[PDB]
Symmetry: D2
Subunit: 237 residues, 4 copies
Amino acid sequence: ADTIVAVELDTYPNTDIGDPSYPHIGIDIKSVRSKKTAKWNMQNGKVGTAHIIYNSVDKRLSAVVSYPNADSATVSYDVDLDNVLPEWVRVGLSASTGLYKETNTILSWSFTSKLKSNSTHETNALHFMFNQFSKDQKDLILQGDATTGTDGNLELTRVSSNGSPQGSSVGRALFYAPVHIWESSAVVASFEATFTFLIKSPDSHPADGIAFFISNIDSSIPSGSTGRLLGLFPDAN
Amino acid sequence: ADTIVAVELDTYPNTDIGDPSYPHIGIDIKSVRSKKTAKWNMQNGKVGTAHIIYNSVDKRLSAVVSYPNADSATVSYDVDLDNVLPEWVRVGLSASTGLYKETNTILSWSFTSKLKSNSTHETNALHFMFNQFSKDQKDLILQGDATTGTDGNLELTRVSSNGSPQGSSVGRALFYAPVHIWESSAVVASFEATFTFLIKSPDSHPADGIAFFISNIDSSIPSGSTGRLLGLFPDAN
Amino acid sequence: ADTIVAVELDTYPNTDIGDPSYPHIGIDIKSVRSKKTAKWNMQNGKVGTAHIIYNSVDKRLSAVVSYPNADSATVSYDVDLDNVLPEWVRVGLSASTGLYKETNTILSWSFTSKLKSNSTHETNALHFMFNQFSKDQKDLILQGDATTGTDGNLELTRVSSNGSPQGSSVGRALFYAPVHIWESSAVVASFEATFTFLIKSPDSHPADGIAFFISNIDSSIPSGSTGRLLGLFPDAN
Amino acid sequence: ADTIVAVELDTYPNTDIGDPSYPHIGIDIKSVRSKKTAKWNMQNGKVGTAHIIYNSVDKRLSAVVSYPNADSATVSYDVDLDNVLPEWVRVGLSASTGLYKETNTILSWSFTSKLKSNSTHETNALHFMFNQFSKDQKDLILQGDATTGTDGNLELTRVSSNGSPQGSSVGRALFYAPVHIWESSAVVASFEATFTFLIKSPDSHPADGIAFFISNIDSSIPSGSTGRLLGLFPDAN
Ligand SMILES: [Ca+2]
Ligand SMILES: [Ca+2]
Ligand SMILES: [Ca+2]
Ligand SMILES: [Ca+2]
Ligand SMILES: [Mn+2]
Ligand SMILES: [Mn+2]
Ligand SMILES: [Mn+2]
Ligand SMILES: [Mn+2]
């Protein structure tokens, strides 16, 4: 099976797989059963921003999510990612709907990876920033239902022409280039990701959420990972 | 045939294909016959730096090369790259040797691409920086004789274990991710590339040079493009 | 007198000092009488973005301005700024009103300056980005009527509490740190500025505009530089 | 008295003020008596690099120092800098010698400060990078014995023309612009500093070290802060 590290914006509480009984931000290490969550005051129809930060000195994966005119939600977990992830990875966004549904719209996505060595010429770096997506976005691998180009946005899950979200949808977008998160001469390794999203549902109960994920390079959508499994996990172990 | 835009650091004057009678920096638009050159005081065994800049407002491709304790060489050409290159490209380094030979060693390589749209959320961006290369550099496509990992460097052409360069060698390295250099809503499109190189030869006449290139995404080494053709062109038309 | 280089977004045509008979983008070298203009389809009450670019290799000062859902205006002028500006400068925004008036609101401002030397350790750099301004913005020098903190914005000219602009107003904001735009070992010197602005007037004829400017470090608002002189020039020579 | 947060590269063990009995990297919160140290294998005459990182989510100040062909030293301390430092600060390098002496040479210095707000337009940023210093570096405040321009370097402490360091010297360099490290709408605040240094002494026992520091904006060299007090503290409380 794939190896997954993710920050989930989980819109629907599934309490039998350990979700708290509210929308929440979570750190997922190789399981949909978050190692840590915080309450998330998700706003149906409002544009949000999530920030994800990590470094190999502090070995702490941290996330913050907010809306304009609102407080943030934040969550941290002590994990050494060198011990979880291979040396080379791909980074991605995943989203799903089930019998409950929402738009999983991404208006922007940026990622920065930095390896500082002990050489006087320290810094290796990867940085991308998407504020506009095109119908043919060749530096993304789209998986399952994901599409680009609708109002210059990334639609991770299925949306009708009417703008209405579809249930039982799963899609992901991975950056084309493998990312080097560990190197033998690196003294400091860090990454930062940001995405702005619009989760809208005609229903009082949207589902199921958006995740920023890091994976083995060859990661694909696990069979039957609609709904609560977020296109990340083959099961809820 | 492939579509090529390159800045050549041409170490060997081939006067029958229009080289001036000295080492020179050149702008190559779809031909090894530079649209413009400047005299280059190449130094056998010294670490050099080349900078390449362009923007869609000025439509001018410019390069500067220098060594520590030395003057620069610079060359400019008015070209609109939207009229030459497809919307999506790959960016690369190429090098060759012929019957005359040199090391084509790259110690570092960086590239920045920026598309600013008329949206209030203006900037799309790609940035990579290599100061260390590893034996398995998965974000590079190596072609022909190119290898990574020897003293943390990129060797574009064949080098023996003794450090001695081999003749009749051609190799390239392309960044894995396609790069988006034109987009319909872009008001300003710009790129910057930098590489530091070490061209060393036991001979008074090194050959044949290093180029930074932009190409169709599916670009490969043209048959018989050792020596004066720099791994860029199938012939000298 | 001060030494001024500016890109003007000139909202009011003053044809006796060479303004074309429409709102226009201009390059000002040591005179309010632009060395080049382009027609600007200014939109009363809409949020705009201007981009300014320059490099010491091409010696071309270029600007682009746009609104969402609208075409850009662009203007270029060949000038070597090493021949106009001292080695050390300050960079700023200026705005004015006269008997005709407008808000000169700045929602964001960024600037990047880069000096690449012939040393293997090439890059000197300055970068700032403001997306929020506070009541006490200590890294800005505010001059004349300029204030910060109203709805997290920079108000270059006087606005009443009702949001109504005042006439006969002049204000500027300069970044606190002097900027080094020429250095003896520099092989490439470049800068990029971006600002997003909101020019709103209850009148069919707003005045007088916003400028991004570079100056001697000790620059101050010239006496009587309200209206058509944009807080930049003591007169219209 | 001034308010100081510093990472010290302490070259001389003063065991009566809590130094361990070896050269060491330390975190100094308002006292020369480090809140945490790690053993530092300082190399007389070799060019080193220190990296300093912090963020307001993890509230952990971390540093790494290394040489080429050598292991790193690292040190971390949990501190919330919003509780120690004012909203506005200056950032600096300090160095001293006493009766034991060393060169306190800086070949390069960079700093990045980022405030991400809950606004859709998230990022405020300051970034500077010095790889070359000039005799008149107007974006630095030099204090005590500090000078710029000798071989394009920053000399924090007194050096004769022969290159020989002087004892009983103290000097600092602060970036000219105040830096905004806390803002009321900020959801994430982070900084990164890097400097490369050359500590050389004709003696087997060099003294006293280099520090990266953050201070009240009006910070000056405390009276009698040569030697073990590093130009940071008026005493060893
Ligand atoms: Ca759930
Ligand atoms: Ca040739
Ligand atoms: Ca006018
Ligand atoms: Ca000490
Ligand atoms: Mn969950
Ligand atoms: Mn040639
Ligand atoms: Mn005008
Ligand atoms: Mn100490």
